[PDB]
Amino acid sequence: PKIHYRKDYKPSGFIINQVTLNINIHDQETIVRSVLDMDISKHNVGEDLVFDGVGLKINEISINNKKLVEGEEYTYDNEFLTIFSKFVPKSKFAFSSEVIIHPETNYALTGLYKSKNIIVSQCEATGFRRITFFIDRPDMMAKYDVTVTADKEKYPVLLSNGDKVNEFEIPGGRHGARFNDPPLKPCYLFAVVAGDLKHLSATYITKYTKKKVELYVFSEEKYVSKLQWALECLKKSMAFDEDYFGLEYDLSRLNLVAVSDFNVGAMENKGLNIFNANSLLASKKNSIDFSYARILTVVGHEYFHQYTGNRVTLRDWFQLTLKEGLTVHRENLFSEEMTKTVTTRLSHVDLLRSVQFLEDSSPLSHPIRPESYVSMENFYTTTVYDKGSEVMRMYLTILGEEYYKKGFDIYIKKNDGNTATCEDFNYAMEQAYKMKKADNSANLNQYLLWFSQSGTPHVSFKYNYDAEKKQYSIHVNQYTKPDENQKEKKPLFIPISVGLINPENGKEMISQTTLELTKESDTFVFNNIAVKPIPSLFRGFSAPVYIEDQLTDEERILLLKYDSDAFVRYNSCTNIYMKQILMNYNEFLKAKNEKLESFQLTPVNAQFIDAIKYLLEDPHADAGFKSYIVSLPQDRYIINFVSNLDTDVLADTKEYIYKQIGDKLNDVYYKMFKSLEAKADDLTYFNDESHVDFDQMNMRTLRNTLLSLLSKAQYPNILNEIIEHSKSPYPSNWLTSLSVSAYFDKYFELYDKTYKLSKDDELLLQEWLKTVSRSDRKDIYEILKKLENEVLKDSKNPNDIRAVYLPFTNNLRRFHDISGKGYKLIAEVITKTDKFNPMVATQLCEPFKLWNKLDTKRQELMLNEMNTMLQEPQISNNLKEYLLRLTNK
Ligand SMILES: O=C(CC1CC1)N[C@@H](C(=O)NO)c1ccc(-c2cc(F)c(F)c(F)c2)cc1
Ligand SMILES: [Mg+2]
Ligand SMILES: [Mg+2]
Numbered sequence: 101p102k103i104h105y106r107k108d109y110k111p112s113g114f115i116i117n118q119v120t121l122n123i124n125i126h127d128q129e130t131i132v133r134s135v136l137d138m139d140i141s142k143h144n145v146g147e148d149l150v151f152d153g154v155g156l157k158i159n160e161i162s163i164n165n166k167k168l169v170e171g172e173e174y175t176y177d178n179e180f181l182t183i184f185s186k187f188v189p190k191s192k193f194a195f196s197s198e199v200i201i202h203p204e205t206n207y208a209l210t211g212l213y214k215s216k217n218i219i220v221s222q223c224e225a226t227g228f229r230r231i232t233f234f235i236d237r238p239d240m241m242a243k244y245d246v247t248v249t250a251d252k253e254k255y256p257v258l259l260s261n262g263d264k265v266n267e268f269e270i271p272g273g274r275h276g277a278r279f280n281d282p283p284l285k286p287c288y289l290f291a292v293v294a295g296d297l298k299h300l301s302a303t304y305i306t307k308y309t310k311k312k313v314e315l316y317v318f319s320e321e322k323y324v325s326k327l328q329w330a331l332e333c334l335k336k337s338m339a340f341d342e343d344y345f346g347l348e349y350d351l352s353r354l355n356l357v358a359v360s361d362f363n364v365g366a367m368e369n370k371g372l373n374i375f376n377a378n379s380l381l382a383s384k385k386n387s388i389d390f391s392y393a394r395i396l397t398v399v400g401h402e403y404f405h406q407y408t409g410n411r412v413t414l415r416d417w418f419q420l421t422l423k424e425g426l427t428v429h430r431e432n433l434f435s436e437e438m439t440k441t442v443t444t445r446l447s448h449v450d451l452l453r454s455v456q457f458l459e460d461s462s463p464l465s466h467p468i469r470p471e472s473y474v475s476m477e478n479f480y481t482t483t484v485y486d487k488g489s490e491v492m493r494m495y496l497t498i499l500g501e502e503y504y505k506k507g508f509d510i511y512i513k514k515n516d517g518n519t520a521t522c523e524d525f526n527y528a529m530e531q532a533y534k535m536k537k538a539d540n541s542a543n544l545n546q547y548l549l550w551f552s553q554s555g556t557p558h559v560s561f562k563y564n565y566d567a568e569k570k571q572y573s574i575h576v577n578q579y580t581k582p583d584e585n586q587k588e589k590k591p592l593f594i595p596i597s598v599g600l601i602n603p604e605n606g607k608e609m610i611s612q613t614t615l616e617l618t619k620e621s622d623t624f625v626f627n628n629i630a631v632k633p634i635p636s637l638f639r640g641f642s643a644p645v646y647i648e649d650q651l652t653d654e655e656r657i658l659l660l661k662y663d664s665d666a667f668v669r670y671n672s673c674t675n676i677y678m679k680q681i682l683m684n685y686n687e688f689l690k691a692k693n694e695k696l697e698s699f700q701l702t703p704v705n706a707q708f709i710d711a712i713k714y715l716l717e718d719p720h721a722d723a724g725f726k727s728y729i730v731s732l733p734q735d736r737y738i739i740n741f742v743s744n745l746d747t748d749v750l751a752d753t754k755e756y757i758y759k760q761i762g763d764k765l766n767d768v769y770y771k772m773f774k775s776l777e778a779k780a781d782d783l784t785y786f787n788d789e790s791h792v793d794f795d796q797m798n799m800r801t802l803r804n805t806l807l808s809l810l811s812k813a814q815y816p817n818i819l820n821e822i823i824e825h826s827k828s829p830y831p832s833n834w835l836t837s838l839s840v841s842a843y844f845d846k847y848f849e850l851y852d853k854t855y856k857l858s859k860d861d862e863l864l865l866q867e868w869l870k871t872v873s874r875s876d877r878k879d880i881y882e883i884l885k886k887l888e889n890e891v892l893k894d895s896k897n898p899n900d901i902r903a904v905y906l907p908f909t910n911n912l913r914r915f916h917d918i919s920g921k922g923y924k925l926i927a928e929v930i931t932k933t934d935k936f937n938p939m940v941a942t943q944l945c946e947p948f949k950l951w952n953k954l955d956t957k958r959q960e961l962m963l964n965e966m967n968t969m970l971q972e973p974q975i976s977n978n979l980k981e982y983l984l985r986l987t988n989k
């Protein structure tokens with residue numbers, strides 16, 4: 101296995117200036133002709149000319165129109181085409197080839213493949229080499245002239261990058277289109293689509309240049325009525341980049357295309373963004389509420405790449421976070437502005453501190469700019485994306501909006517049209533930092549450690565107040581645990597956004613303040629502090645760290661009720677829950693270990709329950725925030741705080757805490773569930789796909805959360821509400837009715853009813869599969885076998901496989917059954933999927949990421965299955981390298 105090292109970057113000895121492609125799609129094969137106009141670079145030392153090319157069938161290859169002969173002048177080993185240097189010209193030359201590829205059977209969904217009846221490409225990161233020979237790396241920038249031909253009846257719509265400059269008929273019922281894309285681009289941004297596509301379209305006029313941009317959104321004909329929201333989101337994205345960043349689209353046309361079979365969410369191919377249908381298509385009758393925020397974020401994400409990734413691209417793949425972390429940050433700014441709900445930011449934090457913190461304390465931990473890789477297909481991690489986004493967001497926190505915008509423009513202007521590195525972005529931010537500090541000696545050299553140092557910092561606090569001097573001090577310490585990437589961890593530049601709350605009246609005691617912690621520890625002192633405050637720390641979650649606030653639960657309750665910052669309120673609640681969880685967990689664990697006949701559990705803090713009631717009953721409070729405060733922290737967040745976690749004991753702990761709170765608040769929950777109904781389920785705009793109300797959807801989230809709590813509690817006659825909920829027009833509601841009915845004998849009646857409602861829309865059926873998969877059923881294993889035999893079968897569609905199995909893996913009691921049978925089941929699915937889609941097979945390994953954090957019996961059971969998978973003779977490169985890293989082999 102070849103290991104690529106970041107320190108080994110060197111420019112190529114060759115240049116590719118022009119790519120001229122002819123892609124002729126036929127029934128059983130696709131023939132690709134390519135002429136590369138090439139040159140010798142200043143770095144050339146007379147080496148062999150080596151092209152990437154994976155799985156290509158060579159018809160012929162030539163240099164300057166002279167056919168080369170296999171063996172004497174080149175070798176091809178199905179991975180690399182080597183032309184011996186004695187046959188490589190010394191000046192500008194043309195390399196041409198004709199190869200045969202087979203999209204129909206390309207079930208890995210990389211390169212050129214068929215998704216249902218659509219031919220589609222996916223070239224990031226190194227998939228272009230599966231289409232034709234290339235020096236397949238992002239610093240090889242070239243012009244593209246692309247002709248696609250195909251049967252006209254099956255493939256009437258042909259698309260690639262650039263301007264469509266010719267359309268022509270071909271004998272035998274065929275036709276072609278030629279696309280010329282003069283601006284230089286890396287090959288991972290190449291795309292082609294052919295299909296019987298239907299579309300919606302609009303014209304957008306840019307803010308400053310007043311350019312007319314044609315916007316097209318495509319899907320198969322069956323789902324064309326689900327395209328409206330995506331088009332609205334694209335218009336919103338363009339406006340936001342214009343309004344916040346001053347950036348306009350510079351091309352004549354932008355196409356978005358939905359396909360059913362896609363390894364991830366979407367891809368930013370220049371002018372031809374290609375989407376998983378589940379991240380582009382929705383309608384109010386056939387989609388759950390989550391789809392609306394999903395499409396907004398994914399359309400925005402791919403649009404924002406046009407500057408951060410496409411116009412400014414990557415020198416090499418180790419810079420991935422430069423485009424992905426920065427684009428997620430841009431996406432997050434956009435979504436926060438569009439939704440105007442505090443739960444948007446809270447949802448990103450919630451994901452980071454569960455999924456990404458788990459990754460960063462696992463054997464897979466890496467910095468956002470890794471030092472090495474074997475598989476690019478495994479490189480697209482929550483660390484690179486979501487911790488990368490938080491590192492990009494900290495620049496905005498440190499600089500403030502005005503100077504952040506100044507630094508961002510410096511980055512765009514300096515690097516527009518070229519490749520770039522993480523250092524280029526830090527340099528632009530540093531120029532703004534010097535301006536903000538009015539100090540040309542200021543620098544951000546320390547900030548670069550956020551790119552190189554792995555692991556999550558821990559930040560802890562101690563406080564002192566002198567009542568006579570009116571002087572308050574915050575002593576802060578930071579610590580990152582050593583790991584495999586750094587034996588000694590250096591202190592980071594950690595920005596700590598803080599407020600000081602007067603406990604007597606809940607008011608702010610200081611102006612907006614961002615402490616700049618740059619040492620292992622520092623003490624921050626404030627004068628003229630008239631009373632002892634409660635500190636509001638890391639407002640907005642201002643750094644990606646473990647916060648140890650060292651506050652009492654009384655102080656945390658005061659913040660939860662009265663602080664101004666949504667995150668600190670949510671975090672104060674989180675911390676109260678965690679203290680309770682760890683305490684009850686240890687009490688249950690000791691009772692288990694000591695085989696106690698009787699024991700005591702510490703009850704939930706009664707003032708905390710009172711505060712939850714206070715917030716729930718406040719008609720001025722936010723429904724989305726309310727849904728967070730009645731939910732315990734995610735299991736994957738909890739596990740970062742417990743060694744040798746016994747998942748059964750944790751399940752018992754959660755059950756006790758939920759029952760303690762429900763025994764006090766269920767009547768409040770039921771009253772709110774009923775009173776929220778009119779606004780939550782308002783149908784006034786049900787048939788307007790342009791009208792999306794994020795507050796209303798949060799109201800439904802709250803109702804569906806409360807219904808789940810009441811159903812688990814067997815609240816009297818709650819089954820009446822469940823059955824009525826099943827009649828709601830909103831899929832979020834009627835799919836919730838299925839999941840909460842798990843606790844009642846009507847489950848399979850609602851199983852059948854919701855199946856019939858879901859079965860005729862491909863994406864809705866996948867949402868139904870997820871709902872069944874996450875159902876809290878004692879017979880869940882039998883239910884999964886029924887889904888396999890009756891619905892999933894041998895589908896190779898990743899959306900189908902992920903829907904059936906991933907939600908179930910979050911079933912704490914059943915997936916972690918002490919027999920190991922859930923580990924065995926998912927391992928069988930992984931090995932089966934690995935035969936045709938190694939990238940998705942590795943995604944299905946996600947439940948094993950926490951293996952060494954569980955109790956020793958479950959560690960052994962998980963490790964056994966991973967070793968079984970590693971011993972499969974046909975294991976893919978992706979899955980092997982992933983499992984080797986995960987098992988510390
Ligand atoms: O959709 C998402 C969610 C984030 C990953 C968490 N991310 C996508 C994104 O940033 N779009 O801008 C995205 C697009 C292509 C790939 C990709 C990489 C490969 F190497 C492949 F082989 C391949 F087929 C696809 C991975 C992620
Ligand atoms: Mg092949
Ligand atoms: Mg405008």
Ligand SMILES: [Mg+2]
Binds near residue numbers: 397428431
């Ligand atoms: Mg996102």
Ligand SMILES: [Mg+2]
Binds near residue numbers: 360862897
């Ligand atoms: Mg299908």
Ligand SMILES: [Mg+2]
Binds near residue numbers: 584
């Ligand atoms: Mg290791």
Ligand SMILES: [Zn+2]
Binds near residue numbers: 368401405423424427
């Ligand atoms: Zn992206």
